[PDB]
Amino acid sequence: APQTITELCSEYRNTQIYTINDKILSYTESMAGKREMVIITFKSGETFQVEVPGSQHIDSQKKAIERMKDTLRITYLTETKIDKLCVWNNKTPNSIAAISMKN
Amino acid sequence: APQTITELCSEYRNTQIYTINDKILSYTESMAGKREMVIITFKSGETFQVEVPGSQHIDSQKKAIERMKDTLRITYLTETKIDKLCVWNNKTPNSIAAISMKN
Amino acid sequence: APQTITELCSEYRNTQIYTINDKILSYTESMAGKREMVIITFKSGETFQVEVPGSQHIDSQKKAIERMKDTLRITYLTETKIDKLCVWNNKTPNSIAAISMKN
Amino acid sequence: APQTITELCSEYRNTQIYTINDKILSYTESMAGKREMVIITFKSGETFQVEVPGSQHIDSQKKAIERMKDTLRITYLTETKIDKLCVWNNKTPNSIAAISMKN
Amino acid sequence: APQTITELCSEYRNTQIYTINDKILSYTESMAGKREMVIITFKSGETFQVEVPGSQHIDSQKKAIERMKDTLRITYLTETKIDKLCVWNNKTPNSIAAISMKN
């Protein structure tokens, strides 16, 4: 029922919006144990992760985590411009909660 | 079974057909807990969502919900023109029930 | 095993081969309860469905139904020429059993 | 720990390598009961199948069978050149064990 | 969590970074029993695998192994440039732990 990524992001603690307005510069993916994750970076210097699935995640988030990784990969590969990221700022690198792209 | 989206839409209460005839303007995807959803917009101003899986959904709809988000993402990335949406209007933003594409 | 769509199709009751030699004109996808289905049409005027999974299906068909819907979406999006369809003609619209594509 | 498809193929009985060096001419996909399979052909006149999953397959092969079908479809759609196929020659059509693509 | 592939790679024994700076020359995929795996090579003559799943992998890695193979396929097909590979060098061909791509 949120209508924008900013509305959605504001419903949670320890988050903020990063306005990226840019394609992904680098995409990294790991299948190493305990580090099953994706890392993206932008020309601005910003690094963000999709976190390893863990105890902080609720059950409904598990498929959503896998979806987000799918999305970032095809976004990287198509040079698609990301508009905004909603991130958790209590993790290093900051962790992706949501993404938006505009055309 | 129904032969068009409008026939299918009319089988349900709280629905209407939006004629879009346009590609998606923005795509938003969230893996935040209890907001595992997708939101799209069009240059018309209209906003639509695929709802978070919930009690209103029957089991057969779970896979369908995942497919619909899959569909909206690739439709956005390929700039594919949507023809119509069948939406439930008892939700804000309106909730996607079905989609048709042509051209 | 059969080597051709025509061979495969002949193994079944209530089927026939439609020769299409065309891309899909329209693609319709529904996540509406009891109508979790895809419908395609052609410039020829013909309309086909992938049926909702039900009691007429054996277990091994469940994953194959989902694949066929995936195939129809990507075939639509890339505007790929379908060669033939094997369909059950005891349904409305006729129900897709198999698909072939050639260049 | 094979380094090539030819080495991998040589580890099994009733296999052989077909050198294709060509895109797929036709792709056929079936969700008919007991024939949940894919068939591909080439201009050469050669025909190959991904078999219906069955008791000849071990558990680890189930996901791999689904992957191979995904690969054949995307390979067909993008007109990607197949280098070699490793196939079991104790089935008709010959059954795909492995694929390589070179470009 | 790590911010680059090199940082991630250095958390593990028997690894090293390969600088590839090149698209994949060949992609090989097997659904043969006990060789359910992917092998890629490059112009350079280098060869890498994603390993058959086994006891060396923890549960967490299962889904990530399937993703990595997904990533290698789409990367081959789009002719996408790989920057680095983190690889376990106690296997032949060396086994991919992580990938990075730039631009």
Ligand SMILES: O=C(NC(CN1CCOCC1)CN1CCOCC1)c1cc(O[C@H]2O[C@H](CO)[C@H](O)[C@H](O)[C@H]2O)cc([N+](=O)[O-])c1
């Ligand atoms: O040894 C590893 N971790 C161990 C952690 N270990 C603790 C001691 O100091 C070194 C790190 C824990 N396991 C428990 C079971 O017995 C082995 C030790 C380990 C080895 C790993 O390499 C082995 O598995 C790989 C696939 O995951 C590759 O196949 C690699 O070739 C193989 O050596 C990988 C990973 N990992 O990804 O997390 C962990």
Ligand SMILES: O=C(NC(CN1CCOCC1)CN1CCOCC1)c1cc(O[C@H]2O[C@H](CO)[C@H](O)[C@H](O)[C@H]2O)cc([N+](=O)[O-])c1
């Ligand atoms: O504690 C969380 N939620 C609530 C805790 N409680 C837990 C049980 O269910 C009811 C809610 C706290 N409330 C939520 C409403 O606003 C007031 C505070 C919470 C923390 C969250 O952040 C933590 O998990 C994240 C991944 O989901 C990140 O890893 C983040 O860094 C971590 O802090 C996230 C989510 N979520 O997405 O739903 C919820």
Ligand SMILES: O=C(NC(CN1CCOCC1)CN1CCOCC1)c1cc(O[C@H]2O[C@H](CO)[C@H](O)[C@H](O)[C@H]2O)cc([N+](=O)[O-])c1
């Ligand atoms: O109430 C629904 N169905 C039928 C019976 N249903 C049975 C379950 O208990 C509620 C009532 C009623 N229809 C009336 C028209 O003639 C046919 C029978 C129903 C409501 C529905 O709307 C509700 O769920 C939607 C998602 O599935 C949306 O979230 C919508 O906003 C919500 O109202 C949807 C669906 N459906 O998808 O099949 C069915």
